[PDB]
Each structure stands twice: as structure tokens, then as C-alpha cells.
């Protein structure tokens, strides 16, 4: 696919549709995960000591949210330029990562967590051509996260 200008403008409008609900997009990434990894609990402060995924933290919500903005430059950026950029705060997320106990094979259960998640927000708008962007998107940026938790670690 490559990204063209024609992909591109499917992934941003893709975006700015997920970011139109915060709260809802991102407990039911959480949710999605917990379903494809029950374990992953214990990571994350503000779900130890719970039962359920809490539905109005802001911690949770802060949280989630810039996940996903993150993948969504990344599509831009490959559209125009052909690449995704490593900045400083690329870095600062590899060591958090390792600080709490995340791994590689983390990484696909958030990727199915998000086209899964992508899906569902852009319903019967959804292309062929649109899966094809936003999986290119996430894994040219995993690809460079990946890379400063190793570099962390
Ligand atoms: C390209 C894919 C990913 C992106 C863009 C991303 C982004 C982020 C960001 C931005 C934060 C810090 C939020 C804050 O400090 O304000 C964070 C924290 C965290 N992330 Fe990820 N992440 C990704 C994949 C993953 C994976 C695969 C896991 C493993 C399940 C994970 C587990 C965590 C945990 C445990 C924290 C700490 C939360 C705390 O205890 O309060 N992330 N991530
Ligand atoms: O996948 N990374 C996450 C970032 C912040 C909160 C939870 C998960």
C-alpha cells in the first residue's frame, strides 16, 4: 500500500473519529486487552486492588488516549515523508515500559486491541484499503517504541 494520499486521508479521518470519545474508546481498549490477556492486570496501578477496569479514571484515561494519537502521526508522517520519527518522548515511553514490567510480546495483544478497536469506531466505512493503513501505521510504530525498551531495559 505505502501509504498514499489516498490512505492517509483514511487514517485521519479514521482518528479524529476515535478521539471523539475518549472515555469510551479507551476503557473499551482496556477491556480488549483484559480479553485477549487477563493477566495483564497486575500492571497497571490503577487496576491493582480493583476488580473491574474502573470506567472514569484519569489516570486510565490520560493514559489510553495517547496511545492512540501516537499511531495516528506516525500515518502522516508516513504519507508525506515515507518514515516514522524516534523523538524524546519515544524514549522517555521505552523506560516507563520497562519500569513497569511490560514485554515484546505485549505488543500484538495492544495492535488487535486497536484494529479491533479501529473497527469498531469507523463501522461500514471500513476498507480494505483502511485496515491496510492503520496496521501499516502501528507497526512502523511499535517498530521504534520497541526499539527504545530495549534500549531501556
Ligand atoms: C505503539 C504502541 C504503544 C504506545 C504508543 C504506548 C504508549 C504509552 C504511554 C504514552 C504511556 C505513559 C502515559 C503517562 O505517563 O502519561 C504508557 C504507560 C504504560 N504502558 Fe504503554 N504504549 C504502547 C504499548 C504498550 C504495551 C504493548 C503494554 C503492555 C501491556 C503497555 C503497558 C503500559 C503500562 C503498565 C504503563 C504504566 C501505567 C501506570 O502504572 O500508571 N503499553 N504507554
Ligand atoms: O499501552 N500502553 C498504555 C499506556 C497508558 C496506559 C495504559 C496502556
Known amino acids: 500500500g505505502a501509504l498514499t494520499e489516498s490512505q492517509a486521508a483514511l487514517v485521519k479521518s479514521s482518528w479524529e473519529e476515535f ?12 477491556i480488549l486487552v483484559l480479553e485477549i490477556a487477563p493477566a495483564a492486570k497486575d500492571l497497571f496501578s490503577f487496576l491493582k486492588g480493583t476488580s473491574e477496569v474502573p470506567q472514569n479514571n484519569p489516570e486510565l484515561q490520560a493514559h489510553a488516549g495517547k496511545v492512540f494519537k501516537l499511531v495516528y502521526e506516525a500515518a502522516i508522517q508516513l504519507e508525506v515523508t515515507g518514515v516514522v520519527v524516534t523523538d524524546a518522548t519515544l524514549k522517555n515511553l521505552g523506560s ?25 469506531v469507523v463501522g461500514a466505512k471500513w476498507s480494505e484499503e483502511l485496515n491496510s493503513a492503520w496496521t501499516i ?15 531501556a531495559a
Open 137 to 151: 501505521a502501528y507497526d512502523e510504530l511499535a517498530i521504534v517504541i520497541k526499539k527504545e525498551m530495549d534500549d
Open 96 to 120: 516507563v515500559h520497562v519500569s513497569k514490567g511490560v514485554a515484546d510480546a505485549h505488543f500484538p495483544v495492544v495492535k488487535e486491541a486497536i484494529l479491533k478497536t479501529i473497527k469498531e
Open 19 to 30: 478521539n471523539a470519545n475518549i472515555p469510551k474508546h479507551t476503557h473499551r481498549f482496556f
